[model samples]
Target: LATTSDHDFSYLSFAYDATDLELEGSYDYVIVGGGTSGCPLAATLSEKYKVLVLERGSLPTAYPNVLTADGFVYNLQQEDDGKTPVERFVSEDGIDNVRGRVLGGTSIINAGVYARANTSIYSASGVDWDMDLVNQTYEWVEDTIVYKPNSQSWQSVTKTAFLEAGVHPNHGFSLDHEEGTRITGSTFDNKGTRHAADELLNKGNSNNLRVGVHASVEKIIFSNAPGLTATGVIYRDSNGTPHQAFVRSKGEVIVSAGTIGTPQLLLLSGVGPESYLSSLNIPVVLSHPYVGQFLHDNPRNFINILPPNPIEPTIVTVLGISNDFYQCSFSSLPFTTPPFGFFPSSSYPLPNSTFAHFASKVAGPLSYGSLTLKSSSNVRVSPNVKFNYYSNLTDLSHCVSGMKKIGELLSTDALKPYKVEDLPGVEGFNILGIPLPKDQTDDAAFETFCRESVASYWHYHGGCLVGKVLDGDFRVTGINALRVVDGSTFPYTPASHPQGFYLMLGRYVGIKILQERSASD
Candidate 1:
């Protein structure tokens, strides 16, 4: 528990009630994010240890906007007053990154649904890896979470488009999949109330889990010795005053502060691209060139228009993702699944890079696209994404290919029932007949639309990853007890939901620590 006057957790305000109470001590583990993975991870660790979860924003609650599936859209427009929504997180020069500030992190305001990577998402990337482990982890995490669909209609423009375009549904989607159609309700109750991480944190025997909202971790506290590990964290209350805390992580310090938050924390702690840190006047911890290199965010387009014979408003809609070519065929489809998603790696490679994007339809960048960025700032999408996306010719080609597939589906007969060209315009350009400069000339234009038109599918991931600041094992190679468990650990963006992967990381790390602890004992 915390001291009575230290800080009040009832409301979301920066002005602290008491100044002296900010000087607190420590716990076993200190988690920075109270969102998706952070929430469950904290609770899991708390099972046998006293833990503290620090949240930079307000607590996640049924605040009208976050109660329904569309709740996240409203938050997308939310300002500090909780009245009108603002497009970005901060007003940095009035141009800040678009992220959620409520508890449960972005999950509190994200389109509640689930997505998984196709076998191709990973196969395209040239890295030594195995899918079996990730697949096993995916299954393990899914079984523990609750997934529910909002309406009975499991078909939408996304699914219909894919089918009309010639893509077949997956086994999970057509049969065992419990969340692909209609407005797939979020991780909420039937009434649309958010069933966020706090629900699990507050569960019985989970009393050891402690969550502190409106608290920001200012920096990481490093051990004085050269090779010693991180012992604790230094955070500031909403009032911008300094405070100290400790976590005797019988093993490691997992940083799950999302993509932006994680790298900023690393750079603030001197663990990023040394040159960038020095530019920012931050002392260097390690000179890892790839600390923030190879960033990826999937750029998506919304085909929201309607078909010639539009159905009544009562007809619910769901998104879907199938194989690369799902728009050419639809009638003989085995089963249906909405919430369609895709990935394209070849679209953004540097010019003429000839990066092996797609190979034998098995694994290729065409399988998935990424939110590509080269720099690591305190913000995730800082309007300067030139890393992997559109950075290469292959990436743009893939995007055009994906769009072409979609366009073909929109032209199909089956799609006549639920079809409309809301995106890209019917003329393929701005009624200017500019002939819509292929994906090449439109890459920048596409990015312009992507940056604003497409917010995160709640899939923004990896600021500092393995072979860079951290390793595949989640350890900050040189930093003894430091680790990052959130999406920031992903080497490449998988063509799916990251929440499950995050949980799997937590469980795996937990077991790793237990094994180490037992050996030491």
Candidate 2:
């Protein structure tokens, strides 16, 4: 087991055990936010070096109902009693920003599914990412996690219809390649249970890697050497009692506290935009202008399908591809789909299924989406965002177009049987006949509705991002020993589901840490 350090408590104080308790300790690497990537990073790091993972929430158990895919749906809604782990994303108006705060972080409450980033995202973005590398990494994940198919992966007529519409133009190509025209299984196991990265990483390792649950890191403590060498962190207990934990850093300190928590922790610890920090009365340690500027989000729209009556569709997701529209850019528009995936009992695909997952270990993105804050105080949803969804007009237009396409698909003969109304279905919202507003065809109404009804798909990326706040390899800019290797390091939203991507990143960075440490030694 890793060593736990002790320090004086100036801000707050309390004591708890290692299991679901506030811990005071440090390691060569302290990765925050034990969601998708944090777990893998911890697993790989501990496999060789001494690592400590700081998870704000406690551990989760196998409650048959809560663990089941359908049963976990209610877990998303924020609880009034505050006992259940999951919390409904709190947003202003119709804007939904769901992020989990339980043992598995957002993965516990997310729509258990996976997808990869669009090829265009990589082509258009001016980054040096090797698609070849990305593609290979994705496949590496498939072997590690049990990627299974669901019986419900392809029952959406709307999705199929959208593919048909694209066939007339350029959008249909996605259906043939990346987007499958059927409802895909979620990341959920066939038993409908969520297989979180935390679940996998926490197992098989007791020594070397020290995973601390129910403890929140308040601020980061850096030594005054050449400016930004973060030696350790100052974390708070369950009751908010703070303690300083030091890391030997024969290597470094990695912070992977998700998009929201990563930036918040950095800012709180005086590592953000200097002007912003000074105004807020916090001293600046490192002035990184791009701390939160490059924030990204995949704006989504809900396509309501009302199938006559009494016919409720149970299958959740369908993956489809149509090359009609190039999504996520000025001219590129992203199509929205119910997150879905399908997995077989074996690592190999089922006998007749031609669908192949090339991205898992190939040069493709594991997933992508947007990032936002939860609480200004804690790592929860932000309060000011209540009903006030601040979205770009371009994002809104794409979403509206996506919704119309979905309506067309549901109306198709293939999907009409299982069709139903989209959720948060706003009456008279669409213009007369079209799924979009006719009179307000311009960008203004689109922008307005987007701010009102636009909900996040719980896909968030880039907080302590590299090439911005952090450097190319996740080391904080101008900082010597500090590195952030979680979702927060993503330069943009991943193209598909982010859990596996996060895990891969953890594996990659864990290796990076080892190489760097070995070289230094």
Model 1 root-mean-square deviation: 10.1
* Residue 210 lDDT, candidate 1, scale 0-100: 62
- Could you tell me the lDDT of residue 211 within candidate 1? 68
- Per-residue lDDT for 1-521 in model 1, tens only? 01112111232222122233347766877777666667666766776777777766665443556655435434553444532222243211111235455556655555444444445545533333445655554554443344543343224434454455555442323212222222322254434444444444543134565667666676787884457678778766656676776876464566777765676677667776677778867778677665655455544433333223323221112333333211111111111121112112212112111110110010122222223223433332332322333444464554555554444544555444442333432332111101222343455654443333321233556656666666656678777877776776665445334444454455556545555567877
State candidate 1's TM-score: 0.70
**Prediction-by-prediction clash tally:** 51, 86
Prediction 2 global C-alpha lDDT: 0.50
**Any idea how many clashes model 2 has?**
86
Q: Give TM per candidate.
A: 0.70, 0.74
Model 2 Cα RMSD, Å? 10.7
Cα deviation in Å at residue 208, candidate 1? 2.2
